[PDB]
Amino acid sequence: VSKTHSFMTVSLIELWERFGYYGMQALIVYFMVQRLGFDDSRANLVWSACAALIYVSPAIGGWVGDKILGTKRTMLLGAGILSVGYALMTVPTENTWFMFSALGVIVVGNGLFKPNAGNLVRKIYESKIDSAFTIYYMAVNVGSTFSMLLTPWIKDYVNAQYGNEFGWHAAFAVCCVGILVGLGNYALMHKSLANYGSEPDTRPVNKKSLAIVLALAALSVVASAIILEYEDVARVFVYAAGVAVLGIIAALILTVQTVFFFIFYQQMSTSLALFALRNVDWDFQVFGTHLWTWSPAQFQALNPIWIMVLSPVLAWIAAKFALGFAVVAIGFFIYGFAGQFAVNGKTSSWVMIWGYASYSLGELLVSGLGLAMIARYMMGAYFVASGISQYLGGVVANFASVPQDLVDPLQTLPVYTNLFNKLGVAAVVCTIIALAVLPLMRRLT
Ligand SMILES: CCCCCCCCCCCCO[C@@H]1O[C@H](CO)[C@@H](O[C@H]2O[C@H](CO)[C@@H](O)[C@H](O)[C@H]2O)[C@H](O)[C@H]1O
Description:
The protein is an all-alpha fold. About 75% of the residues lie in helices and about 0% in strands. The protein has helices at about 5-35, 40-65, 70-90, 95-125, 130-160, 170-185, 190-195, 205-230, 230-245, 250-270, 270-280, 300-315, 320-335, 350-365, 370-375, 380-395, 410-435, 440-445. It has a single domain, classed as MFS general substrate transporter like domains (Growth Hormone, Chain: A, Up-down Bundle). The longest helix has about 35 residues, at about 130-160. Helix 2 packs across helix 9. The protein starts with a helix and ends with a helix. It binds dodecyl-beta-D-maltoside. Dodecyl-beta-D-maltoside binds near residues 145, 146, 153, 156 and 292. InterPro entries: Dipep/tripep_permease, MFS_trans_sf, MFS_Transporters, POT_fam.
């Protein structure tokens, strides 16, 4: 049909997938802390292990779509399995194993979806694949803006019109029908747009291998649910993946810096979220009237929004890594200076907006210089180092962990802004690593 048509279908299904995903991420730690009974140290480690899995997952799943089932087949199977994940997330049971299983299903499902929608964009564009990929990574952001704004509101509204359950499960259902909407989209655009793409989808599905894939898939959901459940299993697994990834020259410092950057990134799912829930005035004032009043989770929506606001402006050299780190640093110093001004126990609001403005500028600046640069100069090692630093990002967000019996926001405020200030300095050390290693880029060329 067309290249922009195919790319359209795949970027749309991407958009709705990410809607579901971030709609769930914006609520998951609050669920574990507020609805389930978890302390924020566990909530962090569990969610961070889950992210590590989710991010090491597409390594296996990308290979399945190229070399075993179709890339379109595997993408679809991934989207279905994902849908079942949120489905489990909406049955109103506070049985941690039920929920961890729902999460495992999301891990398996995501490993099967993400890499293959990504390949489709690339097969659809045969350097205009960058033309494609930026628009792609934008579509992601409008989707995740929509859900990270909506699902916290559904949670609140339903939690009010009804009692505690669903509320959350209402929100996870919203995720599930987002996924379903995406699937119906593709289905109404299937051979139509996509048509040509995938290496082994040009023939019928191999029922022995679909059987073995689904079997091993089920086994992976149980593997996940257990790794999430026992922190020690996760720790040992991440540690093993650690000594293993490090076991196996230019892309080195690049991927290392990627680890650092990902610790800074994992902070918004976790410590920034809890800080936002506990020491931020959810009342947004446009100096000086009132519209409107945040729902703490909705602060995370500030990330894709700002990436959407500053993306057209930036449209108008791993030194961009350096600048990235610097801007992430003053982002964290704005969160650190969240005490020294705009404070009444729990107060700030604009602290979150400027904080996130800065932080996500640093993201846009480093949101490109990863896959493109390494793939223009392995994928597994990158995915393991990335998942690993997601977990590490969890144990770092743990440095601001507030005991459950400590609720005087006047006392929780320092513990957060100590972490945030220390990250700000940690980010400047990375800025020095970035610029120092810069002539090592000139020796090779
Ligand atoms: C595709 C991208 C689309 C991006 C735009 C998405 C639109 C956002 C959809 C949901 C918006 C709701 O998000 C926001 O939630 C907060 C808190 O729960 C609500 O807060 C609301 O109820 C609370 C409680 O009664 C009131 O104090 C407040 O005055 C009122 O605004 C807001 O009404 C709503 O603006």
